[PDB]
Amino acid sequence: SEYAFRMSRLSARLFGEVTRPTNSKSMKVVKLFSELPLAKKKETYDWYPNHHTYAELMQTLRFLGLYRDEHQDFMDEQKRLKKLRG
Amino acid sequence: KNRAARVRVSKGDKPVTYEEAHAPHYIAHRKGWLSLHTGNLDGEDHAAERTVEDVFLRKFMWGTFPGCLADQLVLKRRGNQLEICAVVLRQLSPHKYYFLVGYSETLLSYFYKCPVRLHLQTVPSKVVYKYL
Amino acid sequence: NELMGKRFSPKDPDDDKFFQSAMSICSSLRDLELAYQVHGLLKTGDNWKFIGPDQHRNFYYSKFFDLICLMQIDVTLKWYEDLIPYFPHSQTMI
Amino acid sequence: EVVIPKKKTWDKVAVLQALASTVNRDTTAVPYVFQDDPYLMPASSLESRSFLLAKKSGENVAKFIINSYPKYFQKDIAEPHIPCLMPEYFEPQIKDIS
Amino acid sequence: RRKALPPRTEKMAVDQDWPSVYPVAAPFKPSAVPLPVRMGYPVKKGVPMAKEGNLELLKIPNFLHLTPVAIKKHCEALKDFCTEWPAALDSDEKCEKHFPIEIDSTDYVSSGPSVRNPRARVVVLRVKLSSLNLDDHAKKKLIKLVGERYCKTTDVLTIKTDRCPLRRQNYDYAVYLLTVLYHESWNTEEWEKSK
Amino acid sequence: VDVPKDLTKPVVTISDEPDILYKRLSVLVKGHDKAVLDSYEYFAVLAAKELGISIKVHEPPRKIERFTLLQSVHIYKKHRVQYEMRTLYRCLELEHLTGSTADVYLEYIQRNLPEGVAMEVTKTQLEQLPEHI
Amino acid sequence: HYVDWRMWRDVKRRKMAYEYADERLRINSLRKNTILPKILQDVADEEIAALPRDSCPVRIRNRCVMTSRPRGVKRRWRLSRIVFRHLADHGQLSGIQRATW
Amino acid sequence: SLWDVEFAKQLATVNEQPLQNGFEELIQWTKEGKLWEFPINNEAGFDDDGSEFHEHIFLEKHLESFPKQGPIRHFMELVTCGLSKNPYLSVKQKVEHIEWFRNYFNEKKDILK
Ligand SMILES: [Mg+2]
Ligand SMILES: [Mg+2]
């Protein structure tokens, strides 16, 4: 009814949403600019802290000579053996 | 026959500790969780961040106190403040112990921008639960 | 004594020598009421920051326990058994 | 008609000072800075001196690492931004006399 | 080479200030703790692990601190600071009469460095129109406007605000919304008169 | 023997404004251990009763969430491995509680948390009517 | 020092999608809206078509952080099922019990 | 002022002493502010530069350069609705959206159909 339609118009004017009617393809814009995109959400932008920083820090600290990296010692020892054996 | 966080039964000359001796299906029944946080509970978030960061904590501390520890660690995170507890041997000198304690605490605080503390319990020889 | 009765406010950066040379005067004068009052001095309020350096703290505790010993001594020895905390030097044990 | 208790204002440190004055100092206990286990427990004045000054030297060392490699500690993971936790930068910029 | 001194068990007396030796939360420190409490699955013809290397007591949460004596002491200490509730307010009806507009927010607290979480922004509020409208026309108007924000069984109207990130912003928007709603329900229109 | 003479009390000021009136402080503790939850709630209720406020204790049910993982790596669909995250709730309500009492109590409890627990506060405060209405 | 070159490409795609997130949202609204001119819709269509590659949020994948495994990764934990089982067995994480119900 | 600051830091260094209490180190942590502000409002800081609810929601003052019937009006009204519905973004990002749409249809003003 026109009464209920204008009731909805008034409620929309009061609570912020649009009074004029709108289709689903038009409410697409509203809800899209309401909810942020997955590309911008930090759930996607930050999937994990950077192995860059982690490994660079641990490499520099090994060069300092404090963190005895067993894996790296293993690796470089086998590489020394390979370069000795040709 | 499942192979998951368990040591093979040997002739009986392999000292084994409680946590690594007991099975992973006895964790909640006869063990405690090494870490304690609320990211696993409902309503919280950043649980993946919690896991990755605490794994990095354990790795870095295990490798910056190498040869002194003889068991897993205990993490205790109350709101902002973080606490670590370790069991070590009297291998090296208290000078080195305190120096590395302060060094690691300072570095971790600077990295995680978070208040951190760590405690260590000395033992002459690592406690053994059984000989397997 | 009136200084201790009133609350203190720090204004001069040279308050570290205060503690040590005060206890030196305490060891020179050798009075039990003087020792009581000089203990109440740092025991009144947030003034225990004036101890600071370990050398001055060492001199203070040494002369304090020395006068307390050279004052029964049951109260003194139980005071010590309660408030050793670091291990003191030989002098005090002598 | 109606009575209401009046509002009060406290400092971040006032409650902690209250809780601290509530409890006296621990008796027969080494300083809180020093560890609790007996092996690390410093049992003499000179060795305790060496121990805590080594702690301070380690603090200085950490300062050196952070001010030599800020880019590692550059990320602002903690929500409240704190310059004391931020890396310090004693780096002269490009030539500009003013 | 170096030796460790014996624990504080024999040193600590039976009369002792436990709230003082454990002011804040801290680990178990069995060397300082005199109690022989053990915890662990005992072996056949065996017993649980001694407190020396019992890291499971550390794994579990810690409550040695804050003894009943400590709790009492701190409660009597903070009794000086806590205030008194108005004695005139001793019932729900009287409280709702003195202050009809109820409003409540909420937020979690969790372990970690960060502290914000969007649920801090939400805030709900409630008010019953049985005593506030004082009329019938605007009553019918506003009850026609609101679709499900009301409750006729318990006689309460409830509205939620989260459109702003700040709690204070949500509060201000909610109050201004109620104000404008009352101001727009006061009047009427021709299509509302013709029904 | 060492008992301090003058206790240093923090400064306090009763500002001009009136304190806010919280109708109900309803706190909800989520945990993993019934025993830890019981200890924490006993702590809380004892502190509240010694501070002189009303109390009430309820126990919502246990919530569990499970999800299935492949027990092996490459090819095994019959054999799976499961897990379960158990969260346990505890409610504590406080009625007729002044704003400053709420401040002190929440500071106390928020400093007295254990680690493996989450804490949700719901604060309900009544107020008078606006002026524009 | 990422795990591998596929993780490298995935992170590049994620960064590009983030830094073109808002713009893609705006032009996607301008496209999928209907009451506006269809000529403008087509304009925005070729705009999106000319946008660079690795810019859409659809090319990325919810891969693992440790083992870089794309499949069997939980969105909550972001860890592969295998690494999750590993940590659950070693008791590294908190609050996870075996569903022996 | 400068030498006053030098004297103040000298006084601070003289005051500095080792703490012997968990409460004391907590006082220190609170002094530098790393310890959270209890009660946890989750809004200690990040006030959005004193922004306002009406500045967030009511975009009518931002919407002035187009009539109230056209399709650009329709689209920008829906945009303002979505922006007001979204609490995550602030007035800055909302006006950024609006001005970018302004530039869009004003550089595509060749149509106005
Ligand atoms: Mg099987
Ligand atoms: Mg996909």
Nearest alpha carbon to residue A11 among F120, D32, B69, E142: E142
Measured CA to CA, the distance from residue F129 to residue E37 in angstroms comes to 59
Of B2, B34, B38, B3, residue with least CA distance to B17 = B34
Q: What DSSP letter does each residue of D24-62 carry, written as one string?
A: PPPSS---TTS-SSTTTS--SHHHHHHHHHHHHHHHHHH
Spatial distance between the Cα atoms of F104 and E110, rounded to a whole number of angstroms: 20
Cα(H33)–Cα(H21) distance, integer angstroms: 18
Residue at A5: amino acid letter? F
C-beta separation of G17 from G60 below 8 A: yes
Q: What angle do CA E4, E10, E13 make, to 5 degrees?
A: 135
Pairing of strands F117-127, E101-109: antiparallel
The Cα-based distances of H36 to B54, B81, E111, H43 in angstroms read 21, 9, 11, 11
Q: Which residues of C touch H (CB under 8 A)?
A: 10-11, 13-16, 48-49, 51-52
Closest Cα in chain E, distance from residue D56 (Å): 23
3-state SS, residue C32: helix
Residue with tokens 């009539």: H67
* Number of neighbours of residue F18 by Cβ within 10 angstroms: 14
Is there a contact between B96 and B61 (Cβ–Cβ < 8 Å)?
A: no
- Contact yes or no for H42 and E162 at CB 8 A: no
Q: What are the b/e assignments for F2-11, b being 16+ CB within 10 Å?
A: eeeeeeeebe
Residue B20: is it exposed, middle or buried by C-beta count within 10 angstroms (0-12/13-18/19+)? middle
Query: For residues F70 and G81, is the Cβ–Cβ distance under 8 A?
Result: yes
Query: What whole-number distance in Å separates Cα of residue B111 and Cα of residue D85?
Result: 8
CA torsion sign for E75, E78, E84, E85 is negative
Resolution number, Å = 4.0
Cα(G74) to ligand 2 centroid in Å equals 14
User: What is each CA distance from E94 to D2, E89, E90, E98, E133, in whole angstroms?
Assistant: 11, 6, 7, 6, 19
What are the structure tokens assigned to E69, written together?
């004596």
Do H58 and A14 meet the contact criterion of CB atoms below 8 Å apart? no
* Closest C-alpha among H27, G29, H34 to residue D78: H34
State the Cα–Cα distance between residues F127 and G6, nearest whole angstrom.
59
Q: CA F111 to CA H38: how far, in whole Å?
A: 8
Which of E115, E170, E172, E179 is most worth mutating to test chain H (most H CB atoms within 10 A of its CB)?
E115
Task: Give the burial class of G49: count Cβ atoms within 10 A of its Cβ; 0-12 exposed, 13-18 middle, 19 or more buried.
Answer: exposed
Task: Give the gap in angstroms from C-alpha B16 to the nearest C-alpha of chain D.
Answer: 24
Tally Cβ neighbours within 10 Å of residue F112.
19
Distance, CA F71 to ligand 1 centroid (Å)? 7
Strand B130-131 and strand E156-161: the pairing is: unpaired
Nearest CA-CA partner of F85 in A63, E66, E83, B43: B43
Instruction: Tell me how far apart the terminal alpha carbons of chain G are, to the nearest angstrom.
Output: 43
G57 CA from centroid of ligand 2 (Å): 8
DSSP-derived letter for residue H109 is T
Residue-wise DSSP of B92-116: S-HHHHHHHHHHHHHHHHHHHTS-E
Q: Mutual orientation of helices A2-15 and E137-145 as an angle, nearest 10°?
A: 80
Q: Which residues of H20-40 are buried (b: 16+ CB within 10 A; e: fewer)?
A: bbbbbbbbebbeeebbbebbb
Nearest ligand, CA F71 = 1
HSE, side-chain direction, 13 A CA sphere, residue E125: 23
CA F102 centroid distance within chain = 12
C and G touching (3 or more beta-carbon pairs closer than 8 Å)? no
Q: How far apart are CA B124 and CA B109, in angstroms?
A: 30
State the Cα–Cα distance between residues F84 and F66, nearest whole angstrom. 4
In order, the DSSP letters of B60-100 are HHHHHSTTTB-S--EEEEETTEEEEEEEEES-S-HHHHHHH
**Within chain D, how many helices (H) and strands (E) appear?**
2, 1
Spatial neighbors of C13 by CB under 8 A, at least 6 apart, are H7, H10, H11, H13, H14
What 3-state DSSP class applies to B123? strand
The residue among G38, G31, G33, A20 whose CA lies nearest residue H113 is: G38
Q: Return d(Cα A84, Cα C91) in angstroms, integer.
A: 64
Q: Which residue has the tokens 């491995």?
A: F81
CA distance H56 to H80: 9
Confirm if F84 and G101 have CB atoms less than 8 A apart.
yes
Task: Give the distance (Å) from ligand 1 centre to CA of residue G97.
Answer: 17
Q: What six digits make up the tokens of D13?
A: 């440190």
Please say whether the beta carbons of G77 and G38 come within 8 A: no
Per-domain residue ranges of chain G: 1-91
Rounded Cα gap, residues F76 and F68, in angstroms: 13
Residue H12 corresponds to which tokens in the numbers above?
Answer: 């601070």
According to DSSP, residue B15 is labeled E
- Token pair for A80: 């020394």
Antiparallel, parallel or unpaired: β F21-31 and B116-123: unpaired
Task: Give the Cα separation of A4 and D93 in Å (integer).
Answer: 68
Helix (H, G, I), strand (E, B), or coil: what is residue A27?
Answer: helix
Here the tokens at position E189 are 């229109």
* HSE-CB for F123 with a 13 A CA cutoff: 24
8 Å CB contact between F64 and F85: yes
Instruction: Report how far residue G82's alpha carbon sits from residue G61's, in angstroms, rounded to the nearest whole number.
Output: 18
List F89's β-bridge partners, or say none.
F30
Neighbours of ion ligand 1 (CB under 5 A): F 79
Within 13 Å and on the Cβ side, how many CA atoms surround H4?
1
Q: Is A7 helix (H, G, I), strand (E, B) or coil?
A: helix
Taking only Cα atoms into account, the Rg of chain D, rounded to an integer number of angstroms, comes to 23
Q: How far is CA B44 from CA A18, A47, G87, in A?
A: 34, 17, 20
Which residues have C-beta within 8 Å of that of residue F61, sequence separation ≥ 6?
F89
**C26, C41, C44, C48, C63 from C1: Cα distances, Å:** 14, 8, 11, 17, 20
- In chain E the first and final C-alpha atoms are separated, in Å, by 99
Interface of A with H in 16-35 (CB under 8 A): 16-18, 20, 22, 26-27, 29-35
Q: Which residue has the tokens 């393809």?
A: A25
Question: Pick from B91, B95, C62, B120: which is nearest to D42 by CA?
Answer: B95
Q: How many helices (H) and strands (E) does chain G have?
A: 4, 0
CA distance C29 to chain F (A): 24
Handedness of CA A44, A46, A51, A53 (dihedral sign): positive
Nearest ligand to the CA atom of A38: 2
- Helix (H) or strand (E) run with residue F5 in it: none
- The first and second tokens of residue E48, run together, are 């649980």
PDB experimental method: cryo-EM
> Considering every ligand atom, which ligand is closest to the CA of G70?
2
* C-alpha of B49 from chain center: 18
**CB-based contact B118:B105 (threshold 8 Å):** yes
Q: How far apart are CA A70 and CA B6, in angstroms?
A: 22
Q: Of E76, E83, E121, E123, nearest to E103 (Cα)?
A: E123
For chain D, helix, strand, coil in percent to 5 are 40, 5, 60
Helical segments of chain E, H only: 18-21, 56-59, 68-78, 92-98, 137-145, 167-186, 190-193
The helix/strand/coil state of F94 is: strand
Contact C69, D12 (CB under 8 A): no
Chains contacting G (3 or more CB pairs within 8 Å): A, B, F, H
Q: Give the strand pairing for B74-78 and B81-89.
A: antiparallel
* CA G92 remoteness from chain centre: 27
Q: Euclidean distance between the first and final Cα of chain C, in Å?
A: 31
CA atoms within 13 A on the CB side of G54: 10
CB E102 within 8 A of CB E125: yes
Measured between beta carbons, which residues in chain A are less than 8 angstroms from residue G14?
Answer: 44-45, 47
The nearest CA of chain A is from the CA of D52 a distance in Å of: 21
Q: CA separation (Å) from C56 to C9, C38, D6, D41, H20?
A: 21, 15, 48, 22, 18
Contacts of B61 (CB under 8 A, 6+ apart): B73, B84, B86, B104, B118
Cβ neighbours, 10 Å, residue D17: 18
Contacts of E157 (CB under 8 A, 6+ apart): E126, E127, E128, E129, E146, E149, E150, E151
Upstream peptide bond of F130 is cis (omega within 30 degrees of 0)? no
> Cα B124 to the chain's mean position, in Å?
19
- Return all residues near D22 (Cβ < 8 A) that are at least 6 apart: E73, E74, E77, E78
Measured CA to CA, the distance from residue B129 to residue E41 in angstroms comes to 10
Is residue B74 a contact partner of residue E58, using CB atoms and an 8 Å limit? yes
Q: Identify the closest residue of chain H to C47 by CA–CA distance.
A: H15
Where do breaks (C to N over 2.5 Å) occur in chain F, by preceding residue number? none
Residues 6+ apart with CB under 8 A from G23: none
Residues in chain F closer than 8 A to D21 (CB atoms) = 7-9
Structure tokens, F7: 């206790």
F85 shares contact with chain G (CB less than 8 Å): yes
Q: How far is CA G69 from CA E61, G4, G86, in A?
A: 35, 11, 15
Q: Distance between CA D76 and CA H14 in Å, rounded?
A: 33
